[PDB]
Design a protein around this nucleic acid. Structure first.
Ligand code: MG
Ligand code: MG
Ligand code: MG
Ligand code: MG
Ligand code: MG
Ligand code: MG
Ligand code: MG
Ligand code: MG
Ligand code: MG
Ligand code: MG
Ligand code: MG
Ligand code: MG
Ligand code: MG
Ligand code: MG
Ligand code: MG
Ligand code: MG
Ligand code: MG
Ligand code: MG
Ligand code: MG
Ligand code: MG
Ligand code: MG
Ligand code: MG
Ligand code: MG
Ligand code: MG
Ligand code: MG
Ligand code: MG
Ligand code: MG
Ligand code: MG
Ligand code: MG
Ligand code: MG
Ligand code: MG
Ligand code: MG
Ligand code: MG
Lengths: 218, 288, 87, 110, 170, 97, 95
RNA sequence: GAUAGAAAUUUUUAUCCUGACGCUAUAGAGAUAGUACCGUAAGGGAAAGAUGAAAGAAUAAAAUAAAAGUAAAAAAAAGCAAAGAUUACCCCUUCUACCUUUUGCAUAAUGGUUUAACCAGAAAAAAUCUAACAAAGAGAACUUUAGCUAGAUACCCCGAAACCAG
């Protein structure tokens, strides 16, 4: 049963593609630091002297021989230094993106709930035949609540598989759900995620960050 | 409810292969290439503007500038030392109380106002606290024990019409930062310092009983409360016979910032415990 | 595949080496020790008496607050003299 | 955010009034705010364009658009200029009609 | 790429290795402490906080030392902790006038000084400030043994102090 | 304009390797972890670029302020020249002013 | 105007704006008339009153002052006993 | 005036998880190399590689035969060299080369023999669009009388005589 108060106008269950796009692009972009530095005409090794006189030579006028017109000269604009692409999409938009991602994967029949996540064996061929019999698509993202509580049979079965990926519940996000063709949730992960996402609708704005101790928040 | 989920079954799988931004969210960039944007590309034709050497923003071309021909007059002279007070309406107060953001059972001050997010105080913008403003004097029905930094007579009359307590206190900007953000001060590992006295300009506002200053003589308080009632035509309630009189009589020492705390105390919130000094010089300093 | 262990912030106290030349000097401040006591206190292993000012700090605070922060009677007589002069 | 406390008399002196205990039978629903207020707002654009925004709408939004048109028709003498945003859940009306819209939603009980 | 350690520390960790590490700890402790000298040329202000005359507000005010140049000739004598002052000046004391490079030099005298510990007369180029400091410290030997390194600023004064301190120790 | 006459060896890159499978795992560390760590300290890169974004002039100033005492002689001189040139170009040159 | 500073990388302001101009919260800029302290014996009483009057700034000047002014001076300010506190807001503007 | 510009006071959790929405011989360091060469000297400072498993498979074999320039194959009245066409290449008819600068250029005003590889728009204070939440917004420090937060929209290249220091 749902452990949170459901609103009266909506019955419990047994989409924002724009926000999905925003969260996916943000996850792609915020970790990017572009490592591309080219040398402008100040940073090129030589070319500190006029090669010929200004007038009377008969050829074109030039200053440094390291200008961007010349062959071995510097680059006029180029990529300059390590370039950091860091921006933070706000907290409610990220929460809403997770919400609509879970809603889309529930409505597209790719979200499967598995009780307590045990396997009879550590053979990954068992997982492959289970997915082929249930027609779970190609790729499966299994979640668990905590990293150290994960069962060893499931861990040994998934550590050698490419399309099967096991992640803790804190590592679940929109890029992972849109990458994997099928999402698998455990019931305590459902109870954890429902609280962690439904808290933000009735919350305040932070006076100081939530790692500092609030009254009703840890 | 969400009928788009019914249509989402027939559509193929949502992935990274099919993701569109919102139409209109991105205005596409235009680059200086081609016949449409070329051979001058938005920079004009010769002159100083194509070479980009055009002068500064206030420069008018050798003519004496408009921002330099006007004579100086002090508009912002002493603006960094003028005292600021964030307003709080009685309509906003009654809205917070009726929505349960703040409660009248506990004595209400700027701390619980910030905690209920009714006002925001920026001490580094040299605010000195919260002033009561009288916009909602007609529709105010709450009984409060309100602690502000500045008050007006219509707001005061509106509060002791209902039978509340109005008193006005000074805070130094250090003590006001500590007041508005106690938990960021509580993770500083510093003893609570003394609340400071007002300056020479702010002595008489807190010394007279007409403004309900804390430092005023309490014997001059009831004649002021009855003069407000005589002026504004309401019967003055007997607060001593109320059941919440021990709540409404709760005050602060002029050298004390918080309720129930004292200067020199150190709050270790990891152990949920309190440290007190015992040195005679330390007690003389933090009690002086 | 299997995910990496998640990054978690350790709640144990962290103390830099004072003999290391490479450590920053904001980590060697008394304010850092007071902040570590405010964060943990019991496991920080610092004296609670270090949080209060010493004798010389108390004397210089007494000198500053006695010089620049006058008494209430002094302010009242100052405003009384000023009001008498303007009248 | 704490829940609004139960009061013996409604509406409150601050003007706040809780929604109805059951739900209305019209094929739309307007969610309340996180501050428990009506999601009807003002917006100004280019300094002279005044618009009223009804937000947080679930259901048939065209029904709400039609209802806003016959509610605002006798005051203006013409239909109000409206925009339906289904992918957001937003009705947008030309002009400042926010107080009348909050009042109309207050008798409708949303 | 970058260094791991800042370049400004390269003199400090040079002292932490080699022959310098085996140097005595009391000498290392006297060397590491860079205490500010006595204000000689610039006249300091006592109060840490001052009232602004124009603004009529409390402000924090800090003593900043004026850089003074010590020539190699100054190490052969006792100059009282002063030397050549290099700086700029305005002609006729107006701000809008010409900016001028200006050197200020101390007045020097050839005086012979008697040290009772060494029982020797040294012909030392001295300053009137040095003679005033001798008269204030109540002795030539008292002046050398009482005024520290950053106030004396002379290798000859340090050698004299080392010689008489060794004499008193032995 | 002379293009090559042979087909290149086609790069058989797999979409399901370790990096592409575990890309962006803990991006919601605060959201799903009872906020303790921001997404700032997941950024692997330079000291001055961790959780910060600006234009080239502010980037050069920030580099000189953080790791300025640890840069090289020629790199520090080049960064000072780049800072001076970018200051002059950003303040004294432009169209929109 | 320094659009990008060399220390902080921020946008500076010109103090010649602040030393003679006042910004209201409606965007209006207040200023003194030129020459109100110059040659009072020569000018008439009506001209003296006209120079003693405060005046407003129009659109182009107000946008120039807003461009040369940083975002610190555009904040909402609540001074005690401010005479311009009554003039901070705009009302009955039908545009 | 241009502009310069703090501090008092505050925040910053340890290790691994590091490689590349950086280049591929006019690019990336100048580099095959500070070497040849030019300079008395300080100094300036290059271009240059492409077969295969094996050339201890050179009567040696296999994939482009595509730039400008030539040859195969010199030219036949007449005209910015082309177009309308036509049974027909011309012959007929019709059109004052291209950029830049200008009031106005076929102008006898400037530039270019041609080909290949390089060579020149860069910033988000105010505003517009879109989204989140909305009397509040933002993952602390601020802004708030419909506003706060996030994203997208913006501002070139070469050229002196000169000045100072070593
Ligand atoms: Mg050079
Ligand atoms: Mg030169
Ligand atoms: Mg020629
Ligand atoms: Mg030149
Ligand atoms: Mg080269
Ligand atoms: Mg190069
Ligand atoms: Mg453009
Ligand atoms: Mg652009
Ligand atoms: Mg054009
Ligand atoms: Mg062209
Ligand atoms: Mg031109
Ligand atoms: Mg022109
Ligand atoms: Mg110029
Ligand atoms: Mg002139
Ligand atoms: Mg404020
Ligand atoms: Mg708006
Ligand atoms: Mg001038
Ligand atoms: Mg500081
Ligand atoms: Mg090369
Ligand atoms: Mg050919
Ligand atoms: Mg012809
Ligand atoms: Mg013509
Ligand atoms: Mg023209
Ligand atoms: Mg002609
Ligand atoms: Mg010519
Ligand atoms: Mg020509
Ligand atoms: Mg010409
Ligand atoms: Mg010409
Ligand atoms: Mg030309
Ligand atoms: Mg030519
Ligand atoms: Mg902006
Ligand atoms: Mg000159
Ligand atoms: Mg000159």
């Amino acid at each position: 049963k749902c452990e949170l108060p459901v609103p009266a106008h909506r019955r419990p269950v047994q989409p924002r593609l724009d926000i999905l796009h925003q969260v996916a692009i943000w996850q792609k972009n915020f970790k990017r630091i572009s490592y591309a530095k080219t040398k402008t005409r100040a940073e090129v090794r030589g070319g500190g002297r006029k090669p010929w006189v200004q007038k009377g030579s008969g050829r074109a006028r030039h200053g440094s021989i390291r200008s961007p017109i010349w062959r071995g000269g510097g680059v006029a604009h180029g990529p300059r230094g390590p370039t950091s692409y860091y921006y933070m999409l706000p907290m409610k938009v990220r929460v809403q993106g997770l919400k609509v991602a879970l809603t889309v994967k529930l409505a597209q029949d790719d979200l499967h709930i598995v009780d307590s996540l045990e396997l009879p064996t550590a053979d990954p061929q068992y997982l492959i035949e289970l997915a082929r019999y249930r027609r779970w698509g190609d790729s499966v993202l299994l979640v668990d609540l905590e990293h150290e509580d994960m069962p060893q049979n499931v861990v040994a079965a998934t550590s050698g598989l490419k399309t099967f990926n096991l992640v803790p519940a804190v590592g679940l996000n929109v890029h992972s759900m849109l990458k994997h063709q099928t999402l698998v949730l455990t019931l305590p992960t459902v109870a954890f995620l429902e609280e962690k996402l439904l808290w933000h609708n009735s919350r305040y704005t932070p006076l100081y960050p939530f790692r500092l101790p609030y009254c009703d928040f840890p | 409810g969400p009928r788009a989920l019914d249509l989402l079954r027939a559509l193929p799988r949502v992935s990274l292969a099919n993701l569109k931004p919102n139409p209109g969210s991105r205005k596409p960039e235009r680059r200086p290439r081609g016949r449409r944007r070329g051979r001058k590309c938005g920079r004009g034709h010769k002159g100083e503007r194509q070479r980009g050497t055009r002068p500064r923003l206030g420069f008018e071309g050798g003519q004496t500038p408009f921002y330099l021909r006007i004579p100086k007059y002090g508009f912002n002279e002493g603006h960094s030392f003028r005292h600021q007070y964030q307003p709080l309406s009685l309509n906003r107060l009654q809205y917070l109380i009726d929505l349960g953001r703040v409660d009248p059972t506990q004595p209400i001050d700027l701390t619980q106002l910030v905690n209920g997010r009714g006002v925001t105080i920026q001490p580094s913008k040299r605010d000195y606290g919260v002033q009561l403003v009288e916009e909602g004097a007609d529709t105010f029905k709450a009984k409060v024990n309100i602690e502000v930094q500045m008050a007006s007579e219509l707001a005061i009359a509106a509060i002791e019409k209902n039978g509340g307590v109005v008193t006005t206190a000074f805070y130094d900007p250090r003590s006001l930062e500590i007041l508005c953000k106690p938990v960021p001060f509580f993770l500083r590992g510093q003893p609570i310092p003394k609340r400071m006295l007002p300056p020479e300009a702010l002595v008489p506002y807190y010394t007279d009983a007409k403004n309900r200053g804390y430092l005023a003589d309490p014997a001059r308080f009831p004649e002021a409360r009855l003069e407000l009632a005589r002026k504004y035509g309401y019967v003055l309630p007997d607060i001593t016979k109320d059941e919440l009189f021990k709540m409404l009589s709760t005050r602060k020492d002029p050298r004390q910032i918080f309720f129930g705390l004292a200067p020199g105390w150190v709050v270790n919130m990891a152990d949920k415990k309190i440290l007190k000094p015992t040195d005679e010089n330390l007690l003389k300093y933090y009690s002086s | 595949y299997r995910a990496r262990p998640p990054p978690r912030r350790s709640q144990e106290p962290r103390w830099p080496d004072p003999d290391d030349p490479l450590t920053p000097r904001w980590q060697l401040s008394p304010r850092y020790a007071a902040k570590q006591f405010a964060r943990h206190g019991a496991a920080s292993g610092v004296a609670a008496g270090s949080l209060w000012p010493s004798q010389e700090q108390l004397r210089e605070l007494e000198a500053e607050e006695r010089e620049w922060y006058p008494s209430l009677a002094a302010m009242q007589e100052s405003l009384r003299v000023q009001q008498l002069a303007e009248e | 955010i704490p829940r609004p406390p139960k009061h013996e008399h409604y509406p409150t002196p601050s003007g706040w009034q809780p929604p109805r205990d059951p739900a209305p039978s019209l094929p739309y629903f307007v969610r309340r705010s996180r501050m428990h207020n009506i999601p009807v707002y003002r917006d100004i654009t280019h300094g002279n364009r005044q618009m009223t925004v009804i937000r947080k709408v679930e259901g048939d939004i065209w029904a709400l658009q039609k209802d806003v048109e016959d509610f605002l028709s006798p005051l203006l003498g013409k239909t109000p200029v409206t925009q339906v945003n289904e992918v957001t859940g937003t009705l947008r009306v030309k002009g400042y009609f926010d107080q009348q819209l909050k009042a109309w939603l207050l008798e409708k009980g949303f | 790429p970058l260094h791991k350690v800042p370049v400004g520390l390269w003199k400090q960790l040079r002292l932490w290795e080699g022959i310098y590490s085996r140097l005595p700890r009391h000498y290392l402790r006297s060397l590491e402490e860079a205490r500010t000298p006595t204000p000689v040329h610039y006249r300091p202000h006592g109060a840490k906080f001052k009232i602004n005359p124009k603004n009529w507000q409390r402000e924090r005010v800090e003593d900043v030392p004026i850089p003074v140049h010590y020539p190699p000739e100054s190490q052969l004598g006792l100059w009282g902790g002063e030397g050549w002052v290099l700086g700029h000046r305005y002609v006729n004391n107006d701000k809008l006038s010409k900016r001028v490079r200006k050197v200020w030099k101390p007045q020097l005298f050839q005086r012979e000084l008697y040290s009772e510990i060494l029982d020797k007369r040294f012909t030392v180029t001295v300053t009137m400030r040095t003679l005033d400091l001798i008269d204030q410290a109540c002795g030539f030997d008292f002046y050398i043994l009482k005024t520290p390194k950053e106030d004396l600023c002379s290798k000859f004064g340090m050698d004299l102090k080392r010689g008489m301190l060794l004499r008193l120790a032995r | 304009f002379h293009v090559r006459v042979t087909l290149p060896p086609r790069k058989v890159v797999d979409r399901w390797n370790e990096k592409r499978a575990m890309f962006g795992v803990y991006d919601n560390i605060g959201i799903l972890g009872n906020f303790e760590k921001h997404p700032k300290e997941l950024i692997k890169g330079p000291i001055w670029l961790r959780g910060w974004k600006g234009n080239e002039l502010q980037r050069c100033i920030r580099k000189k302020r953080m790791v300025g005492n640890r840069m090289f002689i020629d790199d520090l001189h080049n960064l000072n020249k780049r800072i001076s040139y970018l200051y002059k170009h950003f303040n004294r040159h432009g169209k929109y002013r | 105007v320094t659009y990008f500073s060399s220390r902080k990388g921020k946008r500076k302001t010109v103090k010649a704006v602040i030393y003679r101009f006042l910004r209201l919260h409606s965007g209006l800029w207040l200023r003194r008339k030129a020459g109100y302290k110059k040659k009072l014996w020569k000018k008439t009483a009506a001209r003296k009153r006209r120079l003693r009057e405060f005046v407003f700034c129009n659109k182009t000047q107000s946008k120039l002052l807003d461009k040369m002014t940083t975002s610190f001076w555009k904040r909402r300010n609540w001074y005690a006993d401010d005479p311009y506190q009554k003039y901070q807001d705009r009302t009955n503007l039908k545009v």
